[PDB]
Amino acid sequence: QVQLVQSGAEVKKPGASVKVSCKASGYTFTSYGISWVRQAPGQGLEWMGWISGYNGNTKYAQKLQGRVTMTTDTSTSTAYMELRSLRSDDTAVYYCARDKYIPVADPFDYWGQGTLVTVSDIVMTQSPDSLAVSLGERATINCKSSQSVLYSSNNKNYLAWYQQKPGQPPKLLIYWASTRESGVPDRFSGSGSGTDFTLTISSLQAEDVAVYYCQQYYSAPITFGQGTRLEIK
């Protein structure tokens, strides 16, 4: 019954601050954490930071350091993100995602619905920014990480694939670079190891039209590819 419910969209003048809330339910709040990810309009995903559900410890992305504050209210299972000194490039959908009791250990399976805020390091590179394929044909998306994400102690690639359809948070499809999340069709296949990874979608269907992202959870900060928009030829 995992659920993450966020506060509504807000419009802010440049230079002001915004506080987004994320109410969690259906699980033991203190056994997990919250990671915040933002998405500029028609653009990729950026990790903002992580906060512990047990003791409120935080880990922020240096990119936003100074401007972002994360807090929790354990009694109400609510996590908060405040962004200060808003600029025009801070316009984005802000997402909360359930994380583990430490960051940089697993990808994101449960997401909030997102909050639109309108203001008036391992690098991941995905090969095609846009891709048009015909119905019934396979589409291939490539992802290169600037350094290996293969952990020698368990021989697993800390690489994930996501599908984001309009109006929805990203959906986890593949983790460990080839293991499907529950319910994910077999026509979605992940392959590769080290620095070069591939997502293959065989027998393309209309329901597969979406934006696809890769993500490394090997080393902080968490980083995403820029996204591959998939349309139909």
Partner 1 sequence: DLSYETTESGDTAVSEDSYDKYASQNTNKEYVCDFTDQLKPTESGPKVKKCEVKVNEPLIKVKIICPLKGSVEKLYDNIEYVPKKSPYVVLTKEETKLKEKLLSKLIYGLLISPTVNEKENNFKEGVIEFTLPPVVHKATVFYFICDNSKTEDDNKKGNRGIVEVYVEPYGN
Burial of 214 (0-12, 13-18, 19+ CB in 10 A): buried
Question: What is the Cα–Cα distance from 44 to 224, expressed in whole angstroms?
Answer: 7
Asked if 5 and 22 count as a contact pair (C-beta separation under 8 A), the reply is yes
CA distances from 88 to 100, 119, 222 (A): 32, 5, 23
The residue from 65, 88, 120, 153 that contacts partner 1 (CB under 8 A) is 153
Q: Which is nearer to partner 1, 140 or 148 (CB)?
A: 148
- Asked if 218 interacts with partner 1 (CB under 8 A), we say yes
Could you tell me the smallest distance in angstroms from the CB atom of residue 165 to partner 1?
29
Binding span for partner 1 by CB under 8 A among 19-27, 61-69, 137-145, 214-222: 214-222
- Asked if 25 interacts with partner 1 (CB under 8 A), we say no
Question: What is the Cα–Cα distance from 4 to 141, expressed in whole angstroms?
Answer: 30
- Asked if 73 interacts with partner 1 (CB under 8 A), we say no
Asked if 211 and 164 count as a contact pair (C-beta separation under 8 A), the reply is yes
- Asked if 103 interacts with partner 1 (CB under 8 A), we say yes
Asked if 210 and 230 count as a contact pair (C-beta separation under 8 A), the reply is yes
Could you tell me the smallest distance in angstroms from the CB atom of residue 143 to partner 1?
17
Q: What angle do CA 91, 174, 178 make, to 5 degrees?
A: 140
* Beta-carbon contacts of residue 110 (< 8 Å; ≥ 6 apart): 2, 4, 97, 98
The H helix count followed by the E strand count for the chain is 0, 23
- Asked if 194 interacts with partner 1 (CB under 8 A), we say no
Q: Which is nearer to partner 1, 25 or 31 (CB)?
A: 31
Token duo for residue 226? 């820029």
Could you tell me the smallest distance in angstroms from the CB atom of residue 158 to partner 1?
6
Q: Which is nearer to partner 1, 114 or 192 (CB)?
A: 192
Which positions from 41 through 60 interact with partner 1, judged by CB under 8 A? 52, 54-58
Could you tell me the smallest distance in angstroms from the CB atom of residue 56 to partner 1?
8
The residue from 3, 25, 31, 203 that contacts partner 1 (CB under 8 A) is 31
- Cα 73 to chain center, whole Å? 23
Could you tell me the smallest distance in angstroms from the CB atom of residue 163 to partner 1?
24
Q: Which is nearer to partner 1, 9 or 102 (CB)?
A: 102
Binding site for partner 1 (CB under 8 A): 30-31, 52, 54-58, 100-106, 149, 151-154, 158, 218-220
